[PDB]
């Protein structure tokens, strides 16, 4: 393998990856669109900006790789390869990643004027993707337009697992990672999180696909809330009673908000021409949204219920919706952790195996 200069950190990729150029920044790493001559297909390469020079960011990647190995689905990115630019367990300090380069990220169609069927289908797919991880007890907690790529033929795939995992009893105290414009309430407020929080995102997404503007403009996590409750009425006392002790007071002390009717949040026009070809009509996407775009964490729809719902229903091909959920060994627990050194090794336990 060789190297090529980029931004600041230079690369150390294998020869089978020519004409190497950058494509996207990265909160956790970097990524180029080099051509895998040895396989024929320009591939996406990312090496991770934060290997394991800490404690809180190695655990993330480690969990991402393993999830990567045990994943597989037409709507979920698939690992093409993993290599290390080092020789012995000593010099180890960089793990690169290969993967099929798509045609662009949703953050592209976000700026396009879909027309149902298409959207109708992507949602379905996106929906399908999530569904996978869920059906095996897994949360993406980062579904956002940025991490959603297409392929010139309404084909879609979710990407990045750098932080995904499963839980039930956990906070965050570091939401300074899960991009807030699409951060869910159970997230924001240090509330517990089942595993549907993913859908929330998915909503803010649809919102982003029909309004063209983000949905809940954040100026600091603290103002996030303010901009959402401002658009969804102040949550019910049933919800309130749910929050931790402290967050409560603040949360109650808020300025009681009207909330809006989705007939008003998303008026007809914002929805693709009603070229009806079935159960596909304006009032449908909206109807769906109002089942997603919801604060209480328990009264918000779900994947299972999602797919099996009118604006999705149609192309519900079990061949890819009732997908055999992926499994894992027993190295995953999530709320636990190991040394800030052997973490490195368990990582090496990968790059070597996968080659």
């Amino acid at each position: 393998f060789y190297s090529v200069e980029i931004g600041d950190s230079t690369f150390t990729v294998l020869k089978r990856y020519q004409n190497l150029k950058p494509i996207g920044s990265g909160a956790q790493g970097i990524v180029c669109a080099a051509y895998d001559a040895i396989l024929e297909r320009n591939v996406a390469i990312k090496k991770l900006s934060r290997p394991f020079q800490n404690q809180t960011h190695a655990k993330r990647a480690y969990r991402e790789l393993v999830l990567m190995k045990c994943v597989n689905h037409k709507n979920i990115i698939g690992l093409l390869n993993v290599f290390t630019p080092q020789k012995s367990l000593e010099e180890f300090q960089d793990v690169y990643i290969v993967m099929e380069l798509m045609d662009a990220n949703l953050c592209q169609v976000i700026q396009m004027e879909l027309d149902h069927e298409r959207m109708s289908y992507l949602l379905y797919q996106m929906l399908c993707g999530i569904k996978h991880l869920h059906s095996a007890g897994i949360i993406h907690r980062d579904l956002k337009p940025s991490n959603i790529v297409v392929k010139s033929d309404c084909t879609l795939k979710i990407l990045d697992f750098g932080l995904a995992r499963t839980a039930g009893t956990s906070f965050m105290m570091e939401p300074e990672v899960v991009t807030r414009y699409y951060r869910a309430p159970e997230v924001i407020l240090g509330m517990g999180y089942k595993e549907n929080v993913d859908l929330w995102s998915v909503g803010c997404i649809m919102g982003e696909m029909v309004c063209h503007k983000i949905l809940f403009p954040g100026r600091d996590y603290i103002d996030q809330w303010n901009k959402v409750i401002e658009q969804l009425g102040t949550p019910c006392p049933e919800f309130m009673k749910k929050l931790q002790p402290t967050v409560r007071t603040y949360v109650e002390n808020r300025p009681k908000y009207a909330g809006y009717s989705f007939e008003k949040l998303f008026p007809d026009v914002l929805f693709p021409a009603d070229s009806e070809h079935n159960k596909l009509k304006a009032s449908q996407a909206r109807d769906l949204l109002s089942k997603m775009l919801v604060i209480d964490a328990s009264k918000r729809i779900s994947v299972d219920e999602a797919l099996q719902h009118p604006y999705i229903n149609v192309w519900y091909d079990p061949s890819e919706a009732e997908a055999p959920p992926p499994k894992i060994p027993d190295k995953q627990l999530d709320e636990r952790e190991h040394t800030i050194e052997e973490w490195k090794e368990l990582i090496y336990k990968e790059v070597m195996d996968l080659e």
């Binding site: 592209q108 396009m112 289908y121 297409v150 392929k151 010139s152 309404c154 149609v314």
Partner: peptide
Amino acid sequence: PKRPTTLNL
């Protein structure tokens, strides 16, 4: 029905 096949990016 059908399924879309193209997506003009």
